[PDB]
Design a protein around this ligand. Structure first.
Ligand SMILES: [Mg+2]
Lengths: 137, 138, 62, 155, 217, 120
């Protein structure tokens, strides 16, 4: 007895005939990337996450906080491109990169991270530690 | 009379049932004369300035090759788009010419060509004398 | 565009030193051949193109 | 399971298939396999140009059947020295053949491809574009003296 | 709607000599030669030279250069051909031997009753003929000589229309193997022309798009 | 004493861990994640971030991998995580960029080889 699938099958898109004209990936890394990309999709069959607690899947989280800083995206991108171009114009930095002797000002990196994208990392780690799961629920 | 022919046919079958191995290529195999010349070779000691200029030259060469590949691909794209426009126009004009043109001439089977040379040929040039012989191994 | 695939070397590990000899064929044109025994020029001869009549004519002319 | 809707989700043997006469139909002239021979005295130049044409075939969606090298041919130069009546060894010249075996092509793309190839020929490299025949297939193979002598005995 | 049909032939002469190297390519050639000499094992000539030089040095307390000198003097005595067969002339643009590094194409001047056109060699054929054989007949007849033309493909290369009633021109590309042009002193204005001089010469918009499928090289 | 996810053995990589290091080396950027067994991201260090982007040139180099590793080790020390597992491919463990990435991670205080589970 045969039953109809409840949705699209995984490998039903590509054509079985004329396989030699279809491009292949020759990299185990490429296949791993594709497999992990597919494994995160909400499949219609019984998957691993449903049985092992994806925490109710999607959750509409109530946001109680200050509005994000309104930054001019065009001017920010222009300034970032100019800074990158000025860094690229230097020849000593290229020499250091080629010779594998280059250092980073970790203090300035940490300061900039806290200024621009530190809040998101802190929020996600507080999710992971369950601060909001017990403070506001 | 007949037994000899039977033995001959049996030797056909036995020899044709064997393998069809290729000739070993002398390029991919290293002759024995190249083993005695390795230990004496002195290193070269690339200096820092030479390494730097070589790295810069490789970067420039990579950029130049990328741009040259892009230009060649653009040229072949222009050729192909002109050709497909030509084919579409001819198909719109007449189908019999399209059928005739979408074949190939039997004259293109033995296509032979030679590349350019370093010096143009010299008119009235006389090679004096000399004989050719094959020393290739069987 | 004739200088596209010219800028290459021997991609092998063990190989003898070879030199850019100038080879001229039976036409008046020359090419560059990477070859040992660093002679500055090599010439291609001919004694087998023509038949007996032209061979005798060339022998008499020489 | 067979009755479950998820049957055949693990089917993979249909995704990989791992267990020539020209097709001349007039308008879709998808002919047979062809040998591109590259003959050169410079081994490095021949290898470089074979690599270039192989990469061009790969980029142009051309099904490259093979990319091989034919046995070398070592010509020996015997030059007649001055005053004549002699013959001395001048040099040895080893000619090398690199052949790219392509599967299928059209008249239009064959014209464009050949145009690109003879525009990008290096110096001192002989081009050849032929159809794959039994003689071209047996060129890579050694002679069969036992077979030839028996056939002589037959005849 | 009346239709006029016409073929045309773009004859390309392969370059006889290789183009010169860009200084970047010259630097890369020097680098490749140096690294090949470095990675190279030994040559018999240099091995014999070093062995003989050491042997004389040690025997003095108790050839290769001659052969090199002989090769050098033979090379200096031998003189190659002139690569620049046009720089000395600077006059004849109609010679087949004009340029040796670039591809050349033929342009022939025709002055008709109502048109004075610097025209690429066109043709005419009745519906019982084929475009390819028409091009072959045109190169055999209108060129008044014996050429050996190698056609690349049966399929066309260029297609252009003009409506007055309309007419169509189909350009096929052919290659020159060996030609013996007779009567070079004729009044028929036939010119061998390169890419840039072709752009300089060809006025009309229809013939200005031959460069679209012609190789720039 | 937490329950490590023992199991598969047939597929790769083994999912018996509490935290895992995952290095993604695209053709442009380099991104190092620390992931929990459920798949969420704990701490990440990316060359796409402006802090490393404006301080580092040519974000694809071995020096880029080393800088990303140092930043990730510092962030892990801030986050209070000290043990994680790294399971590279055989051709990835022999590379120069990720060997120095591991060296920088070890020198930054983060030690691999997550401790054995008590009463496993
Ligand atoms: Mg932005």
């Amino acid at each position: 007895r045969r039953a109809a699938p409840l949705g699209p099958m995984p490998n039903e898109d590509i054509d079985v005939s004329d396989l030699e004209r279809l491009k292949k990936y020759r990299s185990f890394d490429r296949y791993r990337r594709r497999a992990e990309q597919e494994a995160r999709k909400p499949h219609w069959w019984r998957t691993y996450r449903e049985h092992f607690g994806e925490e109710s899947g999607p959750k509409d989280r109530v946001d109680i906080g200050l509005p994000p800083p309104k930054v001019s995206r065009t001017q920010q991108l222009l300034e970032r491109k100019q800074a990158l171009r000025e860094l690229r114009a230097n020849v000593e930095e290229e020499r250091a990169a080629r010779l594998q002797t280059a250092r980073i000002p970790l203090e300035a990196v940490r300061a900039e991270w806290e200024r621009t994208c530190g809040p998101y990392h802190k929020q996600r780690l507080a999710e992971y530690c369950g601060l909001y799961r017990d403070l506001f629920h | 009379d007949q037994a000899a022919k039977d033995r001959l046919k049996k030797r056909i079958r036995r020899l044709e049932k064997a393998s069809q191995e290729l000739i070993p290529i002398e390029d991919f195999i290293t002759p024995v004369k190249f083993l005695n010349k390795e230990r004496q070779r002195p290193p070269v000691e690339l200096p820092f300035e030479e390494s730097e200029r070589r790295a810069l030259l490789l970067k420039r060469w990579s950029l130049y090759k990328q741009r040259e590949h892009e230009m060649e691909r653009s040229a072949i794209r222009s050729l192909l788009e002109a050709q497909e426009e030509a084919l579409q126009e001819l198909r719109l004009s007449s189908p019999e010419l399209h059928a005739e043109a979408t074949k190939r001439d039997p004259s293109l089977f033995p296509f032979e060509r030679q590349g350019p040379d370093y010096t143009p040929p010299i008119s009235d040039y006389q090679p004096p004398e000399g004989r050719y012989q094959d020393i290739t191994k069987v | 565009d004739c200088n596209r695939a010219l800028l290459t070397r021997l991609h092998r590990q063990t190989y003898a030193r070879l030199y850019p000899v100038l080879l001229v064929k039976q036409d008046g044109s020359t090419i560059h051949i990477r070859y040992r025994e660093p002679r500055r020029m090599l010439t291609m001869p001919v004694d087998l193109d023509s038949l007996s009549p032209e061979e005798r004519r060339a022998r008499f002319r020489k | 399971y067979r009755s479950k809707p998820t049957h055949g989700i693990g089917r993979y043997k249909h995704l990989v298939k791992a267990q020539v006469r020209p097709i001349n139909l007039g308008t879709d002239y998808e002919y047979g396999v062809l040998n591109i021979h590259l003959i050169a005295y410079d081994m490095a130049l021949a290898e470089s140009y074979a690599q270039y044409v192989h990469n061009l075939c790969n980029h142009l969606a051309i099904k490259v059947e093979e990319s091989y090298a034919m046995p070398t041919k070592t010509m020996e130069v015997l030059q007649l020295q001055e005053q004549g009546s002699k013959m001395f060894l001048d040099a040895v010249l080893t000619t090398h053949e690199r052949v790219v075996q392509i599967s299928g092509l059209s008249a239009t793309f064959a014209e464009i491809f050949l145009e690109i190839i003879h525009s990008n020929l290096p110096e001192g490299v002989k081009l050849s574009v032929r159809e794959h025949t039994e003689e071209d297939f047996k060129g890579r193979f050694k002679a069969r003296p036992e077979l030839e002598e028996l056939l002589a005995k037959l005849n | 709607s009346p239709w006029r049909l016409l073929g045309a032939l773009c004859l390309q002469r392969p370059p006889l000599v290789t183009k010169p190297l860009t200084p970047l390519q010259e630097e890369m050639a020097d680098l490749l030669q140096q690294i090949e000499i470095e990675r190279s094992l030994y040559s018999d000539h240099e091995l014999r030279a070093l062995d003989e030089a050491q042997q004389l040095a040690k025997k003095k307390s108790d050839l290769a250069q001659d052969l090199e000198d002989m090769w050098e003097q033979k090379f200096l005595h031998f003189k190659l051909g002139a690569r620049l067969t046009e720089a000395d002339k600077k006059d004849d643009r109609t010679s087949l031997h004009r340029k040796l590094d670039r591809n050349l194409i033929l342009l022939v001047r025709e002055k008709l009753g109502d048109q004075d056109i610097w025209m690429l060699p066109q043709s005419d054929w009745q519906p019982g003929e084929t475009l390819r054989q028409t091009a072959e007949r045109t190169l055999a007849t209108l060129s008044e000589n014996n050429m050996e033309a190698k056609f690349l493909g049966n399929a066309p290369c260029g297609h252009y229309k003009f409506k007055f009633l309309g007419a169509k021109v189909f350009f096929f590309k052919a290659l020159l193997l060996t030609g013996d042009f007779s009567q070079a002193g004729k009044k028929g204005h036939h010119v061998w022309v390169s890419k840039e001089e072709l752009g300089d010469y060809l006025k009309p918009k229809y013939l200005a798009q031959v460069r679209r499928f012609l190789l720039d090289l | 004493v937490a329950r490590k996810e023992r199991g598969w053995g047939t597929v790769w990589p083994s999912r018996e861990f509490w935290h895992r290091l995952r290095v993604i080396r695209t053709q442009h950027h380099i991104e190092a994640l620390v992931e929990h067994r459920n798949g969420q991201v704990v701490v990440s260090a990316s060359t796409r971030e402006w802090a490393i982007k404006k301080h580092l040139y040519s974000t694809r180099n071995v020096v880029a991998c080393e800088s990303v590793g140092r930043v990730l080790a510092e962030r892990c020390l801030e986050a209070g995580i000290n043990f994680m597992v790294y399971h590279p491919t055989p051709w990835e463990a022999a590379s120069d960029s990720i060997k120095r990435l591991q060296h920088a991670m070890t020198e930054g205080g983060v030690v691999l080889r997550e401790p054995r589970r008590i009463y496993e």
